[PDB]
Assembly symmetry: D4
Homo-oligomer: 133 residues x 8
């Protein structure tokens, strides 16, 4: 239940945590992993499969090269103590496929190499997510 799932248009600017994609006059700001960003050139058209996240005081967009990745993102968020910034850092470090498998396997060690994930965090994931991927 996200509403905006892809945004396509001319890339106006590429910073290092985000990008602005002009879709019909409206410049949309989506954030993505540096990896995603890299493959993006200003001036050229581009399409991200996005997760949209709404709270009482914000609406942020999150971008990815495919929804199989975006979808995984939404999942990470389903863990108690997983914020967007975080999920984004997790993906910056474990590509979608790379991640899914760590989580099936219960590879704590792997996850632990992520900024902000102690033993306890890593394991809450594997526990709540092992079946789920």
């Amino acid at each position: 239940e996200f509403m905006i799932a892809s945004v396509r248009g001319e890339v106006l600017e590429v910073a290092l945590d985000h990008v602005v994609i002009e879709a019909a006059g409206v410049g949309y700001r989506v954030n993505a992993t540096p990896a995603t960003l890299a493959t993006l050139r200003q001036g050229t058209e581009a399409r991200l499969i996005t997760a949209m996240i709404v709270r009482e005081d914000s609406m942020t967009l999150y971008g990815f090269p495919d929804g199989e990745t975006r979808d995984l993102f939404l999942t990470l968020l389903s863990v108690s103590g997983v914020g967007p910034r975080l999920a984004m850092a997790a993906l910056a470090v474990h590509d979608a496929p790379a991640l899914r498998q760590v989580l099936a396997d219960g590879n704590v060690a792997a996850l632990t190499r992520v900024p902000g994930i102690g033993k306890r965090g890593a394991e809450r994931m594997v526990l709540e997510l092992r079946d789920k991927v």
Copy 2:
């Protein structure tokens, strides 16, 4: 008081609870009954009459082939204990016309064949809705 009542564009993807309709660069994600979905081919343009639903932490879009159906949807929601998922399941099982008449007639038996509706639920509807359809 819904704001977005129809969304028209190229169908980017058709999953089984939803579809993404690109409307001018912006890929919109609407959900609909499998029935609605069926009649939808990727690649081709398409238009859904939508119910838009806003809460503190989400904005979901709900799609239908016509507003006479969409409108009925909004109504189902008007019942205490009727969530979107639910209304959607009710329609998955009773087409708009099929439903309206069950509800006028007070056909509990009929409604009961819906996933998630006991005697008590079915009757809250018929009671609050019998006049209303």
Copy 3:
């Protein structure tokens, strides 16, 4: 501080409390006084100067033929006990110019001819609004 102030496109449907204006694939639903509605034909392009109203559980759009009217609408809302439905009924009965002057003059009698406005209501307006128009 409203965000969306006008919506222009092909009129998809004209009901009696509202209209849907397709603006680039997206069908927007604005509400307006029957008067406004009247001047509107389906099939044809059209532009309303809109008031957009956001709460925790809704976003409604309100349409008018000009912002001098729309702006007055926003004002009505500034009165304690004036809801959108109401402001809309007030305008359905007193055109923008017609209204502004009633309110400057303190013409309670006039306002009283509005559905839902007792002595007390009418006067809260004139009191809080007399200077303001």
Copy 4:
């Protein structure tokens, strides 16, 4: 985490606290410093790098000629007791570059020439922002 970062289209109206920029049928209302406004002619296309601000009961857009300015705006807001109206008045009086440097230098005197900023206010800024610009 702002969502809408630029809006491009035909300028429908230029008032003195804001402007409406039609982006694909949808008239967007952004506010900006008179300075920004000045450089804007009705009838002509135009692009503002915007800050979008969402609360429980509103969504306002704020416009600037560049994001280096817009970005500074977002920052001002990061101070306890700095509202949008305010940040806008601060920029109306100190251009982006002009401001950044006042804040690095700790030039209270300068800031004090802003409507609504006593000693105490000015200093909360310099204190929380001196490093930040």
Copy 5:
């Protein structure tokens, strides 16, 4: 999960929707059905089995001569569209035993004699409560 279930002390005042019971220096204000009230004399000690009701902007106490009645009260409240004032009016008209049985029997007619209960209301109760009493 109510917290305060009885309040015992000298009756300071008996009005017609409520009473103040001083419990150790603190004058507590509980509301009750006129019936309950009747049996109460100022000056004398007294004990009510109370329902305590907390919201974001209030804490009201509701009093009864016994918890078998108080408990029923809490139940009435469990119905969608049953406010405290209401439950209190229902009891003012149907004593606890009298009521329980109407609700088991499904005696709409009976309930209908209550101020504020149409067909539809009465039936929501019987439906959600028939098993429950």
Copy 6:
């Protein structure tokens, strides 16, 4: 629907906006008009008929020598734009009887002598309250 309507005990301290009344070990802090305060000596027992006011982030108690006054207080609060501090200042200046009659009579002039009440304020009262006293 206030909960605590009187508090009786030894006066621990008398400041100029409030007093602490120890009721069984618990020191309660009620606020009152200087007038009320005056008649109060530390060391001695005392009883105030109180209005209790609960919000998401506070619970304040308001004290008076009688509930006919306290009750009027609650009423003042019933006006859009009347805060507790205010109602308290209004009573500091117009005793209960003095006030009730100003409000019946529509004596704006009188009310206007209150700190914080312009023409417009005074009249909102008289309008919403004239019948009510």
Copy 7:
């Protein structure tokens, strides 16, 4: 940060999920494990070390024979997905000492014998709590 940590007085009633303890005229309702309850006779004085739990729409009290137990209760609650009812059921089945040690040892099997705790639940505890007991 609980406020009310013990309540002492005459036991007015002992039901099977709770008890009412009159403390100075005010009948307090605390809930406890059947075990705690057992040791309690109506008519006699009694003291529970309580956890007090406040939300926007309720204030519940939870009772125990000692705070070493009560304190553990508060802890259980510190787990994502642990509600009061739950913590209470956990203690109904594992006395305080019995529990602490299961949690240090990581004895999932043990915890699993609790109503409402699957593998995943049990382990979230042991993970977040193993160090903590």
Copy 8:
């Protein structure tokens, strides 16, 4: 506007961040600086001038040997970024008189010796509080 300003009774337990003071059967839990605590013996009667702090999900009590101290506490809280825990740590380190004067003098150095107060924090205080003490 605090409600509970003192609590007097037999000290049931003295831990190192708090104490429980039984006031008429009800054991109240107040927190205080170790200093305050020290002077407190279990078994004996005792009185703290308290600050009471209410939020949507808690009510905490804060205790001191006098209100001149308690009052200062409330003030600390008036600073953006000053939480209760904090104010308590500040007082644990600077007695009331000691503190007031640091803040008048603008003695950042002094404040800096407090756990959790960088340059920036210390100065927000002195700035917002210098006049205020």
